[PDB]
Design an enzyme around this catalytic site. Structure first.
Site: not given
Ligand code: HEM
Length: 293
Positions: A47, A51, A174, A190
């Site tokens: 993540r 970012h 995700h 997820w």
């Molecule tokens: C429309 C695009 C995206 C949206 C709106 C989005 C939104 C989010 C949100 C709201 C979270 C949860 C944060 C939390 O409460 O800890 C999250 C987690 C995460 N995001 Fe996405 N994300 C997007 C795209 C991506 C992309 C492109 C990647 C990497 C290729 C990614 C990787 C991750 C990962 C691995 C997590 C889990 C992190 C954890 O377990 O701490 N996301 N994302």
């Protein structure tokens, strides 16, 4: 017109130097396995890599991974970045050990390491990111919201130069980790194998019986009886016909997905950077396992 960000190798370092940073990250992943109820830090690093890269703007070449700007307060305290301070703290000790690597190089390498150590595909990586001054720090508000539709997603991604195939591939990230109410106003993982890189995301999307509900932060999320969740933006992948046919392909062929992800991920991490012709070719790091460590 647009800034030019020319990659410059950390003076006198080669492949072997970077493989050592990789091994340190990987060894620490293996060791701090209790984080987030035993998910480990893998997901948070992935993540983080998204970012720091996702602030890029193909119009004036600002943002993106080059400058290691997440290090500055403004970017650090971006509400969209809540929860990332955990990946930051994880990497600090490593940085202290290998102080010659630039920030942008470290943040991005963490993502690569995480993916590969969670059994994902190999991601070619390039060094050369250079730390830039606090004033090159992008303003908050360039990261995507979760409460939107496919239209929003397409549009947003377009700013990073990503096409449909790339958007869908990247989103399969995700499959890792989960949402945290205190971080984003969303709660739940997820899928089930949330620290192993697979096409699970696509299968869950197609195969679960999703119900729209409001969570305790009073946001809407798609809930499944298996105890999984999907954000509106994830769900939008099956509302759009172009997106849905790619979802299906990935659900069908993990290998294809791995290939597409790999390319898309590297592109994401290299957006905004110019690589001179004398620059070393992208490195492909060995895992711990491949080195017998
Ligand atoms: C429309 C695009 C995206 C949206 C709106 C989005 C939104 C989010 C949100 C709201 C979270 C949860 C944060 C939390 O409460 O800890 C999250 C987690 C995460 N995001 Fe996405 N994300 C997007 C795209 C991506 C992309 C492109 C990647 C990497 C290729 C990614 C990787 C991750 C990962 C691995 C997590 C889990 C992190 C954890 O377990 O701490 N996301 N994302």
């Amino acid at each position: 017109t647009p800034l030019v960000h020319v990659a410059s190798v950390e003076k006198g370092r080669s492949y072997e130097d970077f493989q050592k940073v990789y091994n340190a990250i990987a060894l620490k992943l293996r060791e701090d396995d209790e984080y987030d109820n035993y998910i480990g830090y893998g997901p948070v690093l992935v993540r983080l890599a998204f970012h720091i890269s996702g602030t890029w703007d193909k119009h004036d070449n600002t943002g993106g991974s080059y400058g290691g700007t997440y290090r500055f307060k403004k970017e650090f305290n971006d509400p969209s970045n809540a929860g990332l301070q955990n990946g930051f703290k994880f990497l600090e000790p490593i940085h202290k050990e290998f102080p010659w690597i630039s920030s942008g190089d470290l943040f991005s390498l963490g993502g690569v390491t995480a993916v590969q150590e969670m059994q994902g595909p190999k991601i070619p990586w390039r060094c050369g990111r250079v730390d830039t001054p606090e004033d090159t720090t992008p303003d908050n508000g360039r990261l995507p919201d979760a409460d939107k539709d496919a239209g929003y997603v397409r549009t947003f991604f377009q700013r990073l130069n990503m096409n449909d195939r790339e958007v869908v591939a990247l989103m399969g990230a995700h499959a890792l980790g989960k949402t945290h109410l205190k971080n984003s106003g969303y709660e739940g993982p997820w899928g089930a194998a949330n620290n192993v890189f697979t096409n699970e995301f696509y299968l869950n999307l197609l195969n679960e019986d999703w119900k729209l509900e409001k969570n305790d932060a009073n946001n809407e999320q798609w809930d499944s009886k298996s105890g999984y969740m999907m954000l509106p933006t994830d769900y939008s992948l099956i509302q759009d016909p172009k997106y849905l046919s790619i979802v299906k392909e990935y659900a069908n062929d993990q290998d294809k997905f791995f290939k597409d992800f790999s390319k898309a991920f590297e592109k994401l991490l290299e957006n905004g950077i110019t690589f001179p012709k004398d620059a070393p070719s992208p490195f492909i790091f060995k895992t711990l396992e491949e080195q017998g460590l």
